[PDB]
Amino acid sequence: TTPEIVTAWAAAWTGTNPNALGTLFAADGTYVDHAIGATMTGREQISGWKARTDAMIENVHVTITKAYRAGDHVTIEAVYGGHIKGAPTPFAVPMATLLRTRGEEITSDQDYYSLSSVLAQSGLPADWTP
Amino acid sequence: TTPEIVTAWAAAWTGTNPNALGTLFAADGTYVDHAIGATMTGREQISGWKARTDAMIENVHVTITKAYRAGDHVTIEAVYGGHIKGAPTPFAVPMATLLRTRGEEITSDQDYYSLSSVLAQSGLPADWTP
């Protein structure tokens, strides 16, 4: 079924502890969010990204539609939801996450989704920023 | 090592014959672009999607940076580039394409990328529509 690393990754994002995200990564792990264009390096910056995300978005949740592994590469099809603080409405958008692993740890995470969809569903202007 | 179907898929998108895209799919194959929210079903609609894309964007090209197969799933990490007609500048954005195959045919293609990056790099307003 679902690789354990995927379950853990979704729990870390859906949970309320920033360190739970960072602890899944190796010391040299990288995290890139392609919708926002943000790159984090190392466990502390990664955990900080979950913290920052929660600062701006309430009730963030990531649910797994499906995931598959090919050796040390893992692909995840997920739905990313939440409510941007102050926004008229919540959002739920499709997202793909590509992980590279080493042993039990993540060395690279890339998240692909469209920010335009998040904003549009949220009832925010298309050019909106925090 | 890149699956043959991946090379064909990229050539199809990068060439000018729109039918090159639909020929790669099974009769019941589906195509979903998550950035635009467009769903196409069957060969005729899929080839029509390449034609529609070419009508609004010149020099459409998809470049493969990596691809890996897990059973009937194939994950592609790519760069989608081109130049929206009338835009002051071109674009090149990271994209993830998730394919499902049956034999040598594609039964599913889902494309994940951020429309906002495409528009911003193009010099276009975030609410731009064709």
Author numbering:
A (entry chain A), B (entry chain B): 2 to 131
The paper states:
While the exact function of Caci_0382 is not known, sequence comparison suggests that the protein belongs to the nuclear transport factor 2 (NTF2) superfamily. The three-dimensional crystal structure of Caci_0382 from Catenulispora acidiphila, described here, reveals that the protein forms a homodimer, wherein each subunit contains the NTF2 conserved structural fold with a similar binding site to LEH. The protein structure characterization suggests that the Caci_0382 structure is similar to LEH and that it shares a similar binding cavity with a conserved group of residues implicated in LEH catalytic activity.
The most prominent hit was TMA, for which the Tm shift reaches 16 °C at 100 mM. We determined a crystal structure of Caci_0382 with one of those compounds—trimethylamine (TMA). All interactions of the TMA2 with Caci_0382 are hydrophobic and van der Waals. The nitrogen NE1 atom of TMA2 makes hydrogen bonds through a water molecule with the OD2 atoms of residues D34 and D112, and with the NE1 atom of W50. The Caci_0382 complex structure with TMA sheds light on a likely function of this hypothetical protein whereby it could be implicated in TMA metabolism in Catenulispora acidiphila.
